[PDB]
Design an enzyme around this catalytic site. Structure first.
Site, PDB file in Angstrom:
ATOM      1  N   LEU A   1       0.826  -1.201   0.000  1.00 49.46           N
ATOM      2  CA  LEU A   1       0.000   0.000   0.000  1.00 49.46           C
ATOM      3  C   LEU A   1       0.873   1.269   0.000  1.00 49.46           C
ATOM      4  O   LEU A   1       1.945   1.239   0.616  1.00 49.46           O
ATOM      5  CB  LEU A   1      -0.892   0.007   1.248  1.00 49.46           C
ATOM      6  CG  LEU A   1      -1.808  -1.200   1.491  1.00 49.46           C
ATOM      7  CD1 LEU A   1      -2.398  -1.079   2.885  1.00 49.46           C
ATOM      8  CD2 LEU A   1      -2.871  -1.275   0.404  1.00 49.46           C
TER       9      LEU A   1
ATOM     10  N   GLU B   1      -9.151   0.169   8.511  1.00 51.43           N
ATOM     11  CA  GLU B   1      -9.375  -0.034   7.080  1.00 51.43           C
ATOM     12  C   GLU B   1      -9.247  -1.525   6.744  1.00 51.43           C
ATOM     13  O   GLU B   1     -10.129  -2.138   6.069  1.00 51.43           O
ATOM     14  CB  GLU B   1      -8.424   0.828   6.240  1.00 51.43           C
ATOM     15  CG  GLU B   1      -9.091   1.360   4.991  1.00 51.43           C
ATOM     16  CD  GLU B   1      -9.237   0.346   3.877  1.00 51.43           C
ATOM     17  OE1 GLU B   1     -10.342   0.338   3.315  1.00 51.43           O
ATOM     18  OE2 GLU B   1      -8.309  -0.448   3.549  1.00 51.43           O
TER      19      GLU B   1
HETATM   20  O1  LIG Z   1      -3.787  -6.536 -11.465  1.00 53.04           O
HETATM   21  P1  LIG Z   1      -2.811  -7.058 -10.500  1.00 53.04           P
HETATM   22  O2  LIG Z   1      -3.215  -7.605  -9.192  1.00 53.04           O
HETATM   23  O3  LIG Z   1      -1.644  -6.036 -10.070  1.00 53.04           O
HETATM   24  P2  LIG Z   1      -1.569  -4.442  -9.951  1.00 53.04           P
HETATM   25  O4  LIG Z   1      -2.620  -3.668 -10.649  1.00 53.04           O
HETATM   26  O5  LIG Z   1      -0.165  -4.198 -10.341  1.00 53.04           O
HETATM   27  O6  LIG Z   1      -1.906  -4.406  -8.353  1.00 53.04           O
HETATM   28  C1  LIG Z   1      -0.990  -4.643  -7.326  1.00 53.04           C
HETATM   29  C2  LIG Z   1      -0.700  -3.300  -6.573  1.00 53.04           C
HETATM   30  O7  LIG Z   1      -1.912  -2.591  -5.998  1.00 53.04           O
HETATM   31  C3  LIG Z   1      -2.021  -2.927  -4.573  1.00 53.04           C
HETATM   32  N1  LIG Z   1      -3.483  -3.138  -4.356  1.00 53.04           N
HETATM   33  C4  LIG Z   1      -4.231  -4.260  -4.892  1.00 53.04           C
HETATM   34  C5  LIG Z   1      -5.578  -4.222  -4.630  1.00 53.04           C
HETATM   35  C6  LIG Z   1      -6.263  -3.186  -3.952  1.00 53.04           C
HETATM   36  C7  LIG Z   1      -5.529  -2.135  -3.378  1.00 53.04           C
HETATM   37  C8  LIG Z   1      -6.178  -1.128  -2.634  1.00 53.04           C
HETATM   38  N2  LIG Z   1      -5.524  -0.087  -2.194  1.00 53.04           N
HETATM   39  O8  LIG Z   1      -7.280  -1.315  -2.267  1.00 53.04           O
HETATM   40  C9  LIG Z   1      -4.163  -2.120  -3.616  1.00 53.04           C
HETATM   41  C10 LIG Z   1      -1.029  -4.052  -4.326  1.00 53.04           C
HETATM   42  O9  LIG Z   1      -0.500  -3.758  -3.010  1.00 53.04           O
HETATM   43  C11 LIG Z   1       0.023  -3.732  -5.405  1.00 53.04           C
HETATM   44  O10 LIG Z   1       0.880  -2.653  -5.011  1.00 53.04           O
HETATM   45  O11 LIG Z   1      -1.960  -8.216 -11.144  1.00 53.04           O
HETATM   46  C12 LIG Z   1      -1.404  -8.154 -12.406  1.00 53.04           C
HETATM   47  C13 LIG Z   1      -1.361  -9.607 -12.850  1.00 53.04           C
HETATM   48  O12 LIG Z   1      -2.610 -10.331 -12.620  1.00 53.04           O
HETATM   49  C14 LIG Z   1      -2.988 -11.019 -13.822  1.00 53.04           C
HETATM   50  N3  LIG Z   1      -4.272 -10.378 -14.168  1.00 53.04           N
HETATM   51  C15 LIG Z   1      -4.858  -9.238 -13.835  1.00 53.04           C
HETATM   52  N4  LIG Z   1      -6.071  -9.251 -14.464  1.00 53.04           N
HETATM   53  C16 LIG Z   1      -6.257 -10.393 -15.089  1.00 53.04           C
HETATM   54  C17 LIG Z   1      -5.108 -11.092 -14.903  1.00 53.04           C
HETATM   55  N5  LIG Z   1      -4.867 -12.309 -15.377  1.00 53.04           N
HETATM   56  C18 LIG Z   1      -5.892 -12.864 -16.132  1.00 53.04           C
HETATM   57  N6  LIG Z   1      -7.076 -12.149 -16.324  1.00 53.04           N
HETATM   58  C19 LIG Z   1      -7.251 -10.923 -15.816  1.00 53.04           C
HETATM   59  N7  LIG Z   1      -8.394 -10.227 -16.037  1.00 53.04           N
HETATM   60  C20 LIG Z   1      -1.858 -10.799 -14.831  1.00 53.04           C
HETATM   61  O13 LIG Z   1      -1.069 -11.908 -14.663  1.00 53.04           O
HETATM   62  P3  LIG Z   1      -0.202 -12.536 -15.873  1.00 53.04           P
HETATM   63  O14 LIG Z   1       0.899 -11.345 -16.201  1.00 53.04           O
HETATM   64  O15 LIG Z   1      -1.109 -12.935 -16.972  1.00 53.04           O
HETATM   65  O16 LIG Z   1       0.477 -13.814 -15.174  1.00 53.04           O
HETATM   66  C21 LIG Z   1      -1.176  -9.510 -14.299  1.00 53.04           C
HETATM   67  O17 LIG Z   1       0.299  -9.479 -14.395  1.00 53.04           O
HETATM   68  C1  LIG Z   2      -6.637  -3.444   4.148  1.00 52.28           C
HETATM   69  C2  LIG Z   2      -5.897  -2.960   2.869  1.00 52.28           C
HETATM   70  N1  LIG Z   2      -6.481  -3.436   1.575  1.00 52.28           N
HETATM   71  C3  LIG Z   2      -5.915  -4.398   0.811  1.00 52.28           C
HETATM   72  S1  LIG Z   2      -4.154  -5.332   1.202  1.00 52.28           S
HETATM   73  C4  LIG Z   2      -4.572  -6.541   2.369  1.00 52.28           C
HETATM   74  C5  LIG Z   2      -5.755  -7.238   2.188  1.00 52.28           C
HETATM   75  C6  LIG Z   2      -6.123  -8.188   3.136  1.00 52.28           C
HETATM   76  C7  LIG Z   2      -5.311  -8.526   4.246  1.00 52.28           C
HETATM   77  C8  LIG Z   2      -4.122  -7.849   4.442  1.00 52.28           C
HETATM   78  O1  LIG Z   2      -3.358  -8.188   5.574  1.00 52.28           O
HETATM   79  C9  LIG Z   2      -2.267  -7.261   5.872  1.00 52.28           C
HETATM   80  C10 LIG Z   2      -3.721  -6.875   3.484  1.00 52.28           C
HETATM   81  C11 LIG Z   2      -6.689  -4.618  -0.310  1.00 52.28           C
HETATM   82  C12 LIG Z   2      -6.278  -5.756  -1.343  1.00 52.28           C
HETATM   83  C13 LIG Z   2      -7.795  -3.783  -0.238  1.00 52.28           C
HETATM   84  C14 LIG Z   2      -8.957  -3.534  -1.001  1.00 52.28           C
HETATM   85  N2  LIG Z   2      -9.186  -4.203  -2.155  1.00 52.28           N
HETATM   86  N3  LIG Z   2      -9.858  -2.609  -0.621  1.00 52.28           N
HETATM   87  C15 LIG Z   2      -9.658  -1.919   0.562  1.00 52.28           C
HETATM   88  N4  LIG Z   2     -10.563  -0.983   0.971  1.00 52.28           N
HETATM   89  N5  LIG Z   2      -8.570  -2.147   1.342  1.00 52.28           N
HETATM   90  C16 LIG Z   2      -7.634  -3.082   0.941  1.00 52.28           C
END
Ligand SMILES: *O=P(*)(*)([O])(OP([O])(=O)O[C][C]1O[C](N2[C]=[C][C]C(C([N])=O)=[C]2)[C]([O])[C]1[O])O(*)[C][C]1O[C](N2[C]=NC3=C2N=[C]N=C3[N])[C](O(*)P(*)([O])([O])=O)[C]1[O]
Ligand SMILES: CCn1c(Sc2cccc(OC)c2)c(C)c2c(N)nc(N)nc21
EC number: 1.5.1.3
Length: 186
Positions: free
Chosen positions: A22, A30
């Site tokens: 994050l 959160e």
């Molecule tokens: O889409 P991804 O999960 O990765 P991204 O966008 O780089 O996210 C990771 C970062 O964001 C944070 N985070 C995640 C969720 C919520 C949240 C929040 N604040 O609430 C924060 C994490 O900490 C990270 O910093 O993954 C990319 C790989 O997944 C596969 N992918 C995505 N979508 C698809 C998919 N595969 C197949 N179908 C779909 N639709 C891909 O994998 P691959 O390369 O094919 O092996 C992407 O590389």
């Molecule tokens: C609690 C932080 N967080 C996270 S990262 C996380 C998710 C679950 C458990 C955990 O343990 C440290 C970390 C995601 C993926 C995520 C999400 N999609 N939406 C919101 N509102 N918060 C999120």
């Protein structure tokens, strides 16, 4: 299968991650709220399904994986099986959703929660249908390397209240944040 939903926490400059973590320091309530919203069913004997990309999965601390009391499904075209601890693997969002309609899952799954990352959110947000976004607004800018897609407020209505979601500002570790619920139906 019930509701389709996205849940995210995002900074003022639309940041969701940085270097696989994050952008902000951990916020206890959160995390609690994310846990509570994705785990809580409203259909006795069913479980919610969480759908996340591969990077998202590995961004969760191993101790916290799988997300317990939820069916854990990871999206990837490179993996040949579910990661250690995961339950299901699908090669696309469609396939994952197609997969909920199988004799297996169909009757076990209440809500489906897309828990990131950017590409998964983007595809869900732009797909026709009934969708809610559960958005936690982290009320500062944070250095980020992956971003939440645009919310089109012509289609997504910010709800004025929603049961079991607080409406006032929260604050931890000097960081103010608020919960929001958006709905589209198209
Ligand atoms: O889409 P991804 O999960 O990765 P991204 O966008 O780089 O996210 C990771 C970062 O964001 C944070 N985070 C995640 C969720 C919520 C949240 C929040 N604040 O609430 C924060 C994490 O900490 C990270 O910093 O993954 C990319 C790989 O997944 C596969 N992918 C995505 N979508 C698809 C998919 N595969 C197949 N179908 C779909 N639709 C891909 O994998 P691959 O390369 O094919 O092996 C992407 O590389
Ligand atoms: C609690 C932080 N967080 C996270 S990262 C996380 C998710 C679950 C458990 C955990 O343990 C440290 C970390 C995601 C993926 C995520 C999400 N999609 N939406 C919101 N509102 N918060 C999120």
């Amino acid at each position: 299968v019930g509701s389709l939903n996205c849940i995210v926490a995002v900074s003022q400059n639309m940041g969701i991650g940085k270097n696989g973590d994050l952008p902000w320091p951990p916020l206890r309530n959160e995390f609690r709220y994310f846990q509570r919203m994705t785990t809580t069913s409203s259909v006795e004997g069913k479980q919610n399904l969480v759908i996340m990309g591969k990077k998202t999965w590995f961004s969760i601390p191993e101790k916290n994986r799988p997300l317990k009391g939820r069916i854990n499904l990871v999206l990837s075209r490179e993996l040949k099986e579910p990661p250690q601890g995961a339950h299901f693997l699908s090669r696309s969002l469609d396939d994952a959703l197609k997969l909920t309609e199988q004799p297996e899952l169909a009757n076990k799954v209440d809500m489906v929660w897309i828990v990131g990352g950017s590409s998964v959110y983007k595809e869900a947000m732009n797909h026709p249908g009934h969708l809610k976004l559960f958005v936690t607004r982290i009320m500062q800018d944070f250095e980020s390397d992956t971003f939440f897609p645009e919310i089109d407020l012509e289609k997504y209505k910010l709800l004025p209240e929603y049961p079991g979601v607080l409406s006032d500002v929260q604050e931890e570790k000097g960081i103010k944040y608020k919960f929001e619920v958006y709905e589209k139906n198209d």
